[PDB]
Amino acid sequence: TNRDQESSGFAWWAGNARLINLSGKLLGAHVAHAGLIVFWAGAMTLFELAHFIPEKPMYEQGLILIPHIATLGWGVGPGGEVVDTFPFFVVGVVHLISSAVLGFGGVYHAIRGPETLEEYSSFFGYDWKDKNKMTTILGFHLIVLGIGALLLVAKAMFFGGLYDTWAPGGGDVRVITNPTLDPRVIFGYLLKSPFGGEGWIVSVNNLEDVVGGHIWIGLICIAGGIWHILTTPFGWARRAFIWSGEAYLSYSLGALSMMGFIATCFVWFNNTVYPSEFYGPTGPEASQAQAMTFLIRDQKLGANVGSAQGPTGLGKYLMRSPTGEIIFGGETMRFWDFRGPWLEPLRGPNGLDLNKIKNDIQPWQERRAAEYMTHAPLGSLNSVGGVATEINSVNFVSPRSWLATSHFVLAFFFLVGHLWHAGRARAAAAGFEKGIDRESEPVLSMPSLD
Amino acid sequence: RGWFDILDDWLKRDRFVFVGWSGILLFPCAYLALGGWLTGTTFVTSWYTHGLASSYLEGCNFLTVAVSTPANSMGHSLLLLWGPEAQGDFTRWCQLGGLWTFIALHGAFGLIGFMLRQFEIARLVGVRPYNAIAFSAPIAVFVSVFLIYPLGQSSWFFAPSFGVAAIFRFLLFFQGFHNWTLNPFHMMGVAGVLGGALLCAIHGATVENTLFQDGEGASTFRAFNPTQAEETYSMVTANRFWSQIFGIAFSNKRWLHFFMLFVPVTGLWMSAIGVVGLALNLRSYDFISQEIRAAEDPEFETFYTKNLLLNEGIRAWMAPQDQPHENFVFPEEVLPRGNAL
Amino acid sequence: LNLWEQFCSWVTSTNNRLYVGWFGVLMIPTLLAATICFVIAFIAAPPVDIDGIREPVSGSLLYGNNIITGAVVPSSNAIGLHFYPIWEAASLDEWLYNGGPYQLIIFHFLIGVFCYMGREWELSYRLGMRPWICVAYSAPVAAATAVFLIYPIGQGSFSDGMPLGISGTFNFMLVFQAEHNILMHPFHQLGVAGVFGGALFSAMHGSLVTSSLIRETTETESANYGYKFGQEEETYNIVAAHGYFGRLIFQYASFNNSRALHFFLAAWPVIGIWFTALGISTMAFNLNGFNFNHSVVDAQGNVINTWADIINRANLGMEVMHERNAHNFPLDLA
């Protein structure tokens, strides 16, 4: 049993630490938890679909899951218009049904099945200190993850394609036939500065690179999984790490924290794998769209927007970036690295092209800039859209703000959790996680500092 | 024997809620201050004093309800229910803001009662009365902000109103009109509050991470006995850690705990002195040398001059609704605004 | 041992007057670089075009500031989030005009304090301590990271990071309130509960321990001489302190367990500061404080103002005045 503090050493509020060496019950906790994740995905999708009005933009309706399905090319057509909601329904139902299976297995292993697995099965049993068994289970899961990355590839290349906001002629679903295999391109993303105008991997701006990256990741993970099934950790690794359940948990907490901060930046800046048709404009995008909107309006009124000097001496509509490119003026000078399909037709080799601006702006571009300017990702916690001084009227908070804020919060606490468990695993492996031995206090055996 | 000593016996019985002689003052005044606030925020308007809704009954939420100050025309009237303004009319009294002085005054006497309670219990138990002494800082703040500040101004109207958003308004009022962030007495208050929070965190964390292993549990709270003679954590190890991390460390536990009182108590007392100055508009508003330079040199700009422009925006944009008795009408052409906004 | 191992032994030595350690190997040079650049810039740097509109703001003492007005001014809005090291400028004079010092300082500083946090873990491990003082320090680190890095990223420019100065800090706070209504955000309200409560509990704990010091001195001695560094016996009577505080409120509102009490002292301000750091870090993506502007409406449709609407008037005053030459279009969208 051991389900009290006296036998386990852990109080009720740390009760899940009683599971560290109970592989059967711990398996149940994990499988049941996976059921919770899958349950939410299914139920939240059905809720979104039940509330979905197909002629409003997704981002006017508080949707975060239907946008993920639509980006995969399901249910949408040119411009992101919803042509068929049944794929959303299918994804929701199948996740919900599947969570019943996972919940069943989790409850079974948690309260009915064998509490430890080692006596029952040497294959499924494990000791956290068995380094080879640890790398074997890691390897199984690397193979599973690699297969998952190749399912994205298969969707993009063989099962209808993906939604491409950059498709020539307008955003549309497109089959990817020439994924980028050149490692100079794929791993070049990894070596880009994360700072402005570069953006590290968040800068990926076409589906060929996205798909080719997942081909590489798929093969890397499968190959790495095979490697870890067939090898045991090298001496330099053995001497460098702590080998314990809590230590391994701490490593994954640090990893998930890093991934969480990355996803925060992805949804905030990237408009390729987070199409603005579904998620709303980015912050940079909407600020650029405002400058575009008033350039169009004032030029229609007769303004020569190239020669218009603003109050500071910089161009009111157009100015130079620090390296000379023609960019929108006003505060949006900070956002000149922005790139979007409604704006790029106006860009030439030297930046924004004054001749294209004077002659070639289409009504669809004016419409899009007006739409994005008035759906900027600003709004209140009670979902009043607009700046902080806005009056109540518009019920709006951008999906990009919900997704960025939630994942910064989660990534932050997971970094704290990494520090907590990494520090504790170190102390526990060295034998002083419960406090200082009064009869063997290390500082009492050290020379004084002065 | 003697009715006084018999009464003293009963007041000081060891019971679930200690009463004491101080309780005769504390309990009615505290109950009425809290009950008045709950009554006003639930049912009472600020329409006739401020032009504001302020109760759950009118549609406000927990963040926006308040018991608001009386109208400026009331001056510093005690606004007693039986006084010449309300003349015993309970309904009119609420509409005139009588609950504000009710809460402020019963609150003041309740705080007196509470500090007397700290003295009384310390004397009965046999401890030194440092907890009461530390409580002088809350009292200094309450008296300077809710009584002395409005008494220096035109009326109770400009005291803080008892509400969450009402208090936020008070903060921004003090920025725009008093430049209160510039005031070195407020700055010392901030250092004492943040410094106190720092001491709270670092001391709690240090004790919990220099604990001796006094039990076998991985949860370590049970391995303490209130009656034990021994320190539960190592001052020696704690001292070496901070000496090597930060360069200095406590070595004297008595000084450490006195310092934890000294820092926040002193900070609040300093902030109270600055507010006494603001009662008279005796602000740290400007640096004269800054203004002389900026007036003569239109290229000279600092964060100080930037913040005054913000203050000027606050005053012009907030005063007409925030000071309705002034009947301000500011034609929009006179409102200070930067470009476009 | 070999020379590398001798070096490792010195780096990780528990006998250095100041602990170095592997985190210190990164911390020491980065904090030195940040400190030296900050001191020189605060004294002598020329004005900086913070908002990229060729309107340089003077931050240094020699250019007309005092301690209260002085600052190291954030880098130019024309730079945005671009990385602007010294060697990207054509000259030091250009670097100074565009606010190069700010970026050098905040990036070295942030590395330094992250390593200061790791170093707190590291020494606790070398001394046989429990490890979590560094978790308490993660709260101030999160708060500094929010205002120097996360908020600029969300808004697209280090020109919107907090300036390195006293009045520049206030400028950042006022504009933040105008643009996010942070006062109405529950995470900042938790921050206030964290620091008001932390100050309250510091004073409470200080006063309760001091109130129950055991008599060991005469009236002509400081009572502090009644405690000797490293003595084994506790120096105050916690049963007396609990007997006092439990009667001040009621018995079960008072801690009798010193370990529980000190955990509470750690957790309350640390959690409050975590949430207020997350407030800044999420308003960085424009999820802002509660907006009850015009929430109360009468039977005809007239707005009945509340205190939230008065707050809104103050926010408007700051909104329309801030960066008075920088906006050309009607909405402030970052």
Binding site: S448, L449, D450 | V236, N239, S243, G247, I248, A249, S251 | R17, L18, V39, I43, L61, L62, N66, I67, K228, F229, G230, Q231
Partner: peptide, 30 residues
């Protein structure tokens, strides 16, 4: 004159840090 004064006070504080760390009263166990 004002700049000299501010920098002077700052420099005294830095010096004080140095003495307070390296020339502190040494903690002694008794």
């Amino acid at each position: 004159m004002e700049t000299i004064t501010y920098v002077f006070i700052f420099a005294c504080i830095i010096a004080l840090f140095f003495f307070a760390i390296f020339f502190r009263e040494p903690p002694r166990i008794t």
